[PDB]
Symmetry: C7
Subunit: 266 residues, 7 copies
């Protein structure tokens, strides 16, 4: 006759049981509700059936799983084990997604800081080109050849960034080879006359015409000038052509590879 | 005579015991149920006996293990230790699977974004070819030679992506070598006449015919043109052939490697 | 006379003590039981005394350790510390085994997906050969030379996979060098006649006979054809031999390395 | 008639319920409050709508989520599971942001220590230039050519740092080649006379004029001097020119590549 | 006069105190016991005073530390902090030992699988030799030169494994160069006669005598044969010698590097 | 009329509330106190406004946050969630700082062990120079050229360390080339006479004068000697000069690159 | 008048308060005690003021921090937050120290196993030399040149280890070039006579004198012999010298680089 005497014990367990069932059913209707709601809000963005609908299904499963674990705890069964396995799974998936998340974070930083603007000619680790646009997970640029390149944001931020366009003026360099016999002063004079004649070069800024080094086959002269970024490339070509003409007119000779032979007959 | 006086203590322990046994048996029938259910739902997809049936067995073991740990906790024995070892195991397996999970996540991102479409000619880190299809864990493409290549999705997203097809028009480049003696202006005139004659080249877009650099053995001329992607390759060959013919007709001579010897007898 | 008055306190502690001893002894008999059971089931697979028997001993130790920790908790001594050290150890061993586990997981994926079948000629990062079989932790293939190679599954999945056999048809390429003096049209005609004569080449598919590039010592011709994978290698050799014969018959001359010397005496 | 008898139980549950609702509503008004406050304080710094407003929204969501979880715990539902999933997410995002955080920490260290000052000529792993400024996440410097380079702080601290400017004086080195026939002592005398004549060289500091090594084609002389950093470059050029002139005046001859032929006729 | 009225409170705290002291002393005697026991069992294996005795001391310290922490918890002082620091330390040491543990695990796998047997000629990433024995943490092999090499097990499993011995038969390859003038058919006939004469070659298996490629200086012939692994090396040498003799007898001439000069006087 | 009957319940909640408010206010005054104290102690070391004052502000925020979380727990709201997010943040920041902490730890080890002393000539992975000083996070050394280099402590400890200065005596090596025609014994005799004449060489220690190898163009002789570290460099130069003189006196001839031509006219 | 009625509540809180203060003060005296004790025991080993005294200070701070946290818990304030931040810090520092700990563990393994003894000539990844001693964190060896090298233990264990000394006997190899015209048999006979004459070579062990390969400029002969490790180097030199003499006596001629020219005049 312990039953009549333990009515209170029965009350305690019965309220817990009905509360657990109530939790199950309320969580079920809550899950239905949340599932329809998430779709209602998800349709706004572009939506792919094979993936986007799938992820809403994932959410449904996650909610019912949480409510179920909670219910099992309500019943009075230790859920620490299921919590542990769940946490291991979550950690693993987070590790897997770390890579993509890094690209996302980089992209955000690059967007707010703006190291390079759109439409600028830059290089991002050996790939010169003009940027077209920036995106969340990736960057898009066009090469000189015309090929399109896509590069992940996370990869570029780590590497060095070079922005030719940001600087208005840039410097040029020429190297020239001539024979040993030829006079130094004559060549220097000619080169000075040439560079002086040009107009797209900045007089105020430095100009260098000296003998940098002595090659084995021939001596080498170095020339340095400064010009606007836009006209740089044209300047190079024009100067080079003028040099070729002027040297042949002057009498200087360009050097071929040089060989000296000691020559005996056996 | 403590027994009669501690009837309530006995009640407390007895209810816990029978509840633990009930948990064991209900978990057993639940595990049988879940095992048959998972197979019922698993048969839909392609199923390999050596692996797929094995994983259902794994699920059976996992469920019975969870229920068993819970039962041990119900008995009143500290289960924190078994929880700890279980969590270590789960973490380890998650780390092991991280690699494959990364490929999966990448594939998802690539699918939704579509950096490159199927049937496009692209390169994905030094392997040019045409894509055939995209998959969950991997990508499939065909090389020009005809070899098939498979590349994991996770590997390509990290690296740069190049999409030749995405751009309609592309640029070409030629390099040419000629002797120093030969006149600059004559060569330039000839090359201009050639490129002008062609019809598959875009007049509106830039055209470059200049002396880029001075080689040691010979001077070098650079030529740049723009044409449609489809006809690019043909254009290259036709232009090259026409150049060879035109130069020999003109009298210009192509250069062989050049050597100059100072020559003494011992 | 607190003892008589605190009989209940004594009861509480005494039941805990005897329950702890009971747990110890039941865990001992359980451990004996489990140890014999694991051997009974382990004998089925191949079993090495120096390792396999050792791991059963490990299991014995693990079970007795768990039961002992639980008993210490039953006595009323904080076991959180022993749990912590145990968890650190488990994490460390899991990290150590991560590498091998990765190979295992890869192997599973490769088995179910079947990127390459057994008996196919494939390359798996610079090692061409024919696969012999697939295994759990590793893959086995034979090289052309006849050497056997073993490669871990985890390593290959990361790298690119190339399956020559999967594709029925493949393409070939030849490169040829000839003197500048020689006529273009004559050579082209001869090469076309040759390739046309062959029967193992696919007429429907493309055929290319053009001047690809101008070498310094000599010009270069490129030839491309398509043929079945099986007969490809033979086709290459036969074509090459026929070419050698046909050129000497025609009067064309193959080029040696070319040198031009300006020659003065001192 | 358990209700009348369990008034106290009802009181207990009712106070918990109303307290949970109170927590929900107070947390709601708190969240509104915090959201407006964070904007009020955020406007001070530069603010981008697409990102900065977004992060305030994130904060709103985070606060309401915390309060909601707390409320669920107040109701009496186990929240350990939701805590676990939340912690996994937090760990993952922290891992993702680790990279950028590293750059930030580096930048801080570099700022306080000041290995290199602004406006100094330094190299930071193969990129010589002058620093312009230091920033939080990145560093900015200008190359000699005039190109701008941006380099992340985290990358440079790991690598070696070279500060030319920090040292007032620096050393120079010349290498010279001459024929075997030429006398050693004469050359040494000439070189000593040259270096002695210069004035921008530090007499007190060492000066080296010796035969370092015997090349195959010719012998090699090494020269070392010390000069101020500013005038170093000029000194090099002037010395080199003077050397060329002095040698031709002296009668020494510079060497061309040397070849010796044993010469037989077949 | 609260003392007389709170006798029970005093009892509660006093029993806890004496139990804590009892735990301390029992743990002390337990630690002495365990320390002597571990030595008793440790002497069996080889034992180094500077390290092995040290590790027994470590065990003593660990046990007393655990018992001490437990005692502090018994007193009623929160030990969660000491647990936390202890767990951090354990995690760190586990990370440090991960490397060695990996080698151990690899060694186990290699032992049970036996990719390569002892006394076999194998290469394990560019180090050819004969294995001598396998060990727990490392592998031992001898090179052809006679040098001894030790390689850690963990390093080799990651890399490719090549087992020459496992395969009974292997293939050989020869490359040969001859002048352009020389007849193709004559050379082919001679080579066929040679290989046919040999007896250590497998007739049933393939034999290849064809013109593989056209070198610039000379044409190249390829020869392939199959022979037993043991006699392979000898076969190579004998064949090569016979070839040299046969060619000079036949009248064919081996080629020297070939140069062609266009030769003008200035 | 439950209020009058539940006075005790009201007491319980009221004491908790006032205690929570007391905790808030005491923590506030404690935070003010700690903030002023930390500055008082921080001024001793060099202090940067933009960073050092900022970190004191950080401490203020941290303390108020801890006290606030504690207060929320006092109120009776589950704080496990806020604890979880806080722990994730702490883990992330610790990971970020791991890099710098590694440099710090290395520096400590290097300081106490002293592998290389200050003012010694050492190389630390391809950067030879003299150390100037050691610091906490980095090391400073000067190169021979005079450039200053800074290298992080963590990077050098991993790599090999070479200490020229630690060893008093060092060895030298010379290589010499001579013509085939020249007698072996004569050359050996001459070289022995030379090295014997020198005084800065250690007679007791080994001396080697032998023919090491046969070059294609010429034979090579190797010479090895031992001398004090300080005088090593001078010894090299003096020996080399003496050798040049002695050979020309003896009649031996140094070799130029050697070519042999078979020479036919077409 | 709740105070008089709640005397017991007051007792409960008052005992907790005084116990907390007692814990604070006992922990303070305990910390003083431990601080002096640790110094007393620390003086035995070499002790640096800037670091070693600092670490004792660290210990003082750690103990007072633990006792303080415990006290805060005794007061009744949730300390889980402070525990969490502390654990994050500990994890971070452990990660930082992981590197050095790895070197320590390696060193231990190497010490007990003894792969290489002290005073042996070994190479440890491209650095040949003689070991001098082994240490805890690092290894010390001397190079042949006389330079001292220090290498961390953790780095070497990962890489291959080569122990020349462990093996008593070693093998040698010579390569020789001769003209095509020269007879094979004569050369073989001469070489056999030479090697047979020597006495420091092991007759029982193999001896190889064969034509290994056909070079373009000349044919190549390979010779292999076995000798004791100590006398190996001397044997090489003596054999080489004898070979040079014997060939010139025999009439064989060593080959120079060979060139063949087809020679036409334009």
């Amino acid at each position: 006759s312990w039953l009549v005497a333990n009515q209170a014990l029965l009350l305690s367990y019965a309220v817990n049981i009905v509360a657990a069932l109530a939790i199950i059913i309320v969580g079920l209707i809550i899950a239905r509700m949340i599932s329809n709601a998430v779709n209602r809000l998800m349709i706004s963005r572009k939506i792919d059936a094979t993936v986007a609908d799938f992820l809403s299904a994932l959410v449904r499963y996650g909610i019912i799983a949480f409510t179920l674990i909670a219910a099992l705890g309500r019943v009075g069964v230790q859920t620490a084990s299921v919590i542990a396995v769940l946490g291991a799974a979550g950690l693993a998936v987070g590790l897997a997604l770390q890579g993509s998340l890094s690209n996302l974070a980089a992209g955000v930083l690059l967007v707010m800081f703006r190291p390079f603007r759109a439409g600028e000619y830059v290089d991002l680790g050996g790939v010169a080109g003009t940027v077209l646009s920036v995106q969340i997970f990736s960057t898009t640029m066009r090469t000189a050849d015309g090929k399109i390149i896509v590069i992940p944001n996370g990869k570029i931020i780590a590497g060095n960034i070079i922005n030719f366009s940001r600087e208005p003026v840039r410097r040029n360099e020429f190297i020239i080879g001539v024979a040993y016999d030829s006079d130094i002063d004559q060549v220097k004079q000619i080169l000075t006359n040439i560079i002086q004649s040009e107009d797209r070069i900045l007089k105020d800024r430095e100009m260098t015409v000296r003998l940098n080094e002595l090659g084995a086959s021939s001596i080498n002269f170095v020339v340095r000038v400064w010009s606007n970024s836009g006209d740089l490339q044209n300047v190079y070509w024009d100067v080079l052509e003028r040099i070729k003409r002027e040297f042949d007119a002057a009498g200087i000779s360009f050097p071929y590879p040089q060989m000296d032979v000691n020559f005996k007959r056996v």
